């Protein structure tokens, strides 16, 4: 007999599964009954497994209860084997121990099916359990946004007019942005050739294309389905969305118009990054120089401590409530534009034989999704910093500040939060504390979270890329200060909108005990050491 | 806890917004195939996960064999046997018409030239009368005993959910009453009286006779629907002395 | 993106022949049409479960209520009221405007004709069933029998 080798695993398992079900038919059926109909039961088992794979509700209306119990039990066995194989193959792929194209493609398909099952679960749980935002949190967010826009004397973005001055230039920029992806001149397919023909048709007759775009912005609120697939980066998967090209042209023009109007009307304060002014290594250098050029930043003679906090917003994109998003976007733009913005995100996501309606999360495959992400991040920056320190950081609206400058030394020293930067969802905050404020913060954190056995060292994380002298020295006071700072930051953000996790974050303290200040901006691990220390 | 928890430095219009918002504000029914909630909730993540099987409900007029009703109309006393297994809705509608006086004392609904004669409807317009539920019950024609042949008694209707009390004895085979009128059964007595009623002169505009065959009396020679109601009442009264 | 009635009839026949989940097989028949276009045309207009009736009072009350609750989310609103997103969006706009075999036998006959022509002019390790019993199993004997 032939052994069961690797290429003969899966089918053989199915064969064995079939045989087991056949045995469980032949002793379940009572005395009599000439028509066994076991082939029909095996077809029902295959259909139940295929409905499990596509997240389709499987229910035969008339079917005997022990046969249904048998089918559900064996389908759960097959699903457990499938999911454990997917987990083991993903661990082997991330470790690099497997160089196999079929294993990689099969595992990518399995994880796509598992993700869409979890996403459909999340959408149904959002529609059943109600909005997580409650009532007063959304009212407080809306009121804070209204007060911030009133404080900045912001002029709202109008509709694109009938004879706009720069509409052809924005159309040319959007068409070049769409023609960027098809410059390989490969074999393509039917849909890519259709998109390229639509791009050329809009390029030849820009006036008709602009009229169709403004008609789509004014009228349509229901859209076609979007395709989804995944890029395997071998450590994580990246969702890639596919949109109908007419909607892609309209969304690209809307993205260009919205970003030009927001830059002209100065909606975004200069701490929101990536700006167009600098590359991210220049952002790293400007952050280091803004740390270095603070007033008495390295003086630790009186117990002053510097705290550098780096974190993310975790599931920021998945928790943007669309009604609250529409109410927030109505503060900025015309209502038809914001209705298009909200209604574009409520579409049907398709993959092979699965369809689900996206009602809670945002879709990052939209051309204008970056504007919504940075606007929601502006709202989160207002929640973190507060209105007073954000108005101090942005300066007066008649004379706005640059990225890391203030109007005065007294405006710098009025708050512990010296520097702030947000890179899409990454958060980098630089605090400077005196001794009394740090002692009070440590006292309040130990009042809420007591720890007499000094176990805060154990859960604390450190940068392992540096040597032992270059790493953070883990004294009790600096560790307690870092945990106090992280607890006070985490208390500001409501968990319904976004959360900040300790494991994905890193807090470094510069004091008399720690001479090095460690952080990680973009792909750069940076260690700052003063010449005094 | 309190709504002002997770809320410090409340704004003005936040406070009047929340103030305005708060100022504004079964044993014998076990059908053995169960509900489909467990299998659909397991195979799909779009429902609430239920882990225990629940048996599906089923009364569907659980009667004993076929009924037989003797209608004494102006043609005479004719007995018709309605098959409850072929159509329980048609036999239940005929028994409710003969029981709740929708057919007793009623006029002839229709009468064709030796094709079909309809009676038992109090309106007499072809599909009048009332069923057991008041509104007209669902209509379905069986293939074993359809509304074809001589003396085929059917709950006369223009389609489904329209047969209430109009009982039509078809004297000829026709496909028009198939899958439109719920076929109860066949006439087992009074064939000469039914043939004389069908062979009389009738107005073809309303498809009814000049002299309406009015059912003077109704008798239950065999009542399957009343026996099913008595069995359902016995099953209810088996657990009613301690469940009030 | 236009849809002739001829293409709608061909699409209806292709759905009734090939089921639901096949779309590229359906789109092979329709010239200058894609499978995504065929699926969208079926699920938007040509599906028989689409309610092509008039709105009731209850349907309009639920539509106005749900449009007040969840603004401009028609893909969520539409399965609650049972209509599609385009019909309910158009009706909501209208309500706001109002408020304002034989071959093998022939081959065998030709082979028999060639065999008779060769007879008129190995065994490949097989079993000849016409010569004797292929696997002779004698019946069991007991208490009777005098043969024949």
């Amino acid at each position: 007999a032939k052994t069961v080798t690797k290429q003969r695993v899966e089918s053989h398992f199915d064969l064995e599964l079939r045989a087991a079900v056949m045995h469980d038919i032949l002793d379940m059926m009572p005395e009599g009954i000439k028509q066994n109909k076991a082939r029909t039961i095996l077809q029902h088992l295959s259909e139940a497994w295929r409905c499990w794979k596509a997240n389709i509700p499987w229910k035969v209306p008339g079917l005997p209860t022990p046969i249904e119990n048998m089918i559900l039990r064996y389908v759960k066995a097959k699903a457990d084997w499938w999911t454990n194989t997917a987990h083991y193959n993903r661990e082997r792929i991330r470790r690099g121990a497997t160089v196999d194209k079929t294993v990689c493609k099969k595992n990518l398909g399995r994880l796509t099916r598992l993700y869409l099952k979890a996403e459909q679960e999340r959408q149904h749980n959002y529609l059943k359990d109600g909005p997580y935002i409650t009532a007063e949190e959304a009212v407080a967010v809306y009121t804070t946004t209204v007060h911030w826009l009133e404080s900045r004397r912001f002029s709202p973005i109008p509709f694109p007019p009938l004879s706009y001055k720069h509409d052809t230039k924005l159309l040319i920029l959007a068409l070049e942005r769409l023609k960027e992806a098809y410059s390989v001149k490969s074999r393509l397919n039917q849909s890519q050739r259709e998109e390229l023909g639509l791009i050329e048709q809009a390029y030849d007759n820009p006036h008709e294309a602009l009229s169709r775009i403004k008609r789509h912005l004014l009228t349509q609120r229901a859209f076609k389905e979007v395709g989804i697939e995944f890029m395997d980066l071998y450590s994580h998967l990246v969702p890639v969305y596919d949109v109908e090209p007419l909607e892609k042209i309209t969304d690209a023009y809307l993205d260009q118009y919205l970003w030009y109007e927001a830059d002209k009307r100065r909606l975004f304060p200069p701490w929101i990054k990536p700006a167009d002014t600098e590359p991210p290594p220049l952002l790293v250098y400007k952050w280091c120089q803004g740390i270095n050029n603070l007033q008495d930043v390295w003086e630790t003679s009186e117990g002053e401590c510097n705290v550098m906090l780096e974190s993310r917003f975790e599931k920021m994109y998945e928790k943007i409530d669309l009604t609250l998003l529409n109410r927030l976007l109505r503060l900025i733009v015309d209502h038809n534009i914001a209705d298009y913005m909200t209604a574009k995100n409520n579409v049907v996501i398709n993959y092979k034989d699965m369809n689900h309606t996206n009602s809670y999360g945002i879709i990052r495959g939209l051309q204008f999704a970056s504007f919504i992400v940075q606007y929601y991040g502006l709202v989160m920056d207002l929640l973190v910093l507060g209105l007073h320190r954000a108005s101090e950081m942005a300066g007066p609206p008649q004379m706005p500040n640059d990225f890391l400058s203030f109007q005065d030394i007294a405006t710098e020293a009025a708050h512990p939060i010296r520097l702030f930067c947000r890179y899409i969802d990454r958060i980098h905050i630089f605090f400077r504390f005196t001794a009394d404020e740090a002692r009070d913060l440590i006292q309040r954190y130990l009042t809420e979270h007591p720890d007499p056995n000094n176990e805060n060292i154990v859960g604390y994380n450190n940068k392992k890329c540096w040597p032992r002298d270059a790493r953070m020295r883990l004294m009790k006071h600096d560790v307690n200060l870092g945990r106090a700072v992280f607890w006070d930051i985490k208390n500001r953000l409501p968990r319904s909108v976004t959360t900040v996790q300790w494991e994905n974050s890193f807090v470094s303290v510069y004091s008399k005990d720690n001479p090095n200040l460690l952080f990680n901006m973009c792909g750069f691990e940076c260690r700052i050491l003063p010449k005094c220390r | 806890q309190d709504p002002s928890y997770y809320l410090k430095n409340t704004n003005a219009e936040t406070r009047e917004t929340l103030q305005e918002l708060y100022k504004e504000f079964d044993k014998l029914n076990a059908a053995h195939y169960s509900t489909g909630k467990v299998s659909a909730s397991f195979t799909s993540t779009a429902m609430v996960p239920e882990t225990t099987h629940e048996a599906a409900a089923i009364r569907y007029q659980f009667v004993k064999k076929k009924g037989y009703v003797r209608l004494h109309t102006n043609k005479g006393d004719l007995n018709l046997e309605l098959h409850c297994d072929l159509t329980p809705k048609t036999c239940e509608n005929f028994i409710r018409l003969c029981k709740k006086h929708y057919y007793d004392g009623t006029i002839f609904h229709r009468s064709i030239r030796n094709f079909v004669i309809q009676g038992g409807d109090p309106t007499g317009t072809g599909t009048g009368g009332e069923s057991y539920w008041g509104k007209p019950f669902k209509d379905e024609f069986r293939p074993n005993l359809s509304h074809t042949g001589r003396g085929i008694l059917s709950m006369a209707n223009s389609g489904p959910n329209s047969n209430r009390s109009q009982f039509f004895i078809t004297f000829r085979s026709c496909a028009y009453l198939d899958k439109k009128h719920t076929i109860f059964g066949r006439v087992v007595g009074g064939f000469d009286v039914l043939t004389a009623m069908e062979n009389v002169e009738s107005d073809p505009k309303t498809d009814r006779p000049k002299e309406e065959i009015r059912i003077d009396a109704t008798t239950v020679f065999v009542d399957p629907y009343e026996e099913a109601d008595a069995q359902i009442a016995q099953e209810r009264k088996t657990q009613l002395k301690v469940a009030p | 993106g236009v849809w002739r009635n001829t293409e709608d009839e061909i699409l209806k026949a292709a759905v009734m022949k090939y089921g639901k989940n096949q779309w590229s097989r359906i789109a092979s028949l329709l010239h200058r049409k894609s499978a995504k276009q065929c699926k969208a045309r079926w699920y938007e207009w040509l599906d028989p479960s689409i309610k092509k009736t008039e709105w009731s009072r209850e349907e309009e009350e639920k539509l106005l209520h749900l449009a007040k609750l969840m603004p401009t989310q028609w893909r969520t609103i539409a399965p609650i009221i049972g209509r599609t997103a385009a019909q309910c969006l158009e009706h909501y706009e209208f309500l706001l405007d109002k408020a304002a075999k034989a071959r093998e036998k022939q081959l065998e006959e030709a082979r028999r004709l060639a065999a008779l022509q060769k007879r008129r002019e190995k065994r490949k390790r097989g079993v000849d069933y016409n010569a004797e019993i292929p696997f002779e199993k004698k019946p069991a004997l007991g208490f009777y029998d005098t043969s024949e």
Binding site: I41, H44, T323 | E24 | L69, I80
Partner: peptide
């Protein structure tokens, strides 16, 4: 114990708090 043939495919309520949230936003 009757088993119907397999019809192969290859061969909703809203929580009320939603409403309250919408009303709050309008106010």
């Amino acid at each position: 114990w009757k088993i119907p043939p397999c019809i192969s495919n290859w061969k909703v309520h809203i929580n009320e708090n939603f409403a309250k949230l919408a009303e709050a936003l309008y106010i």
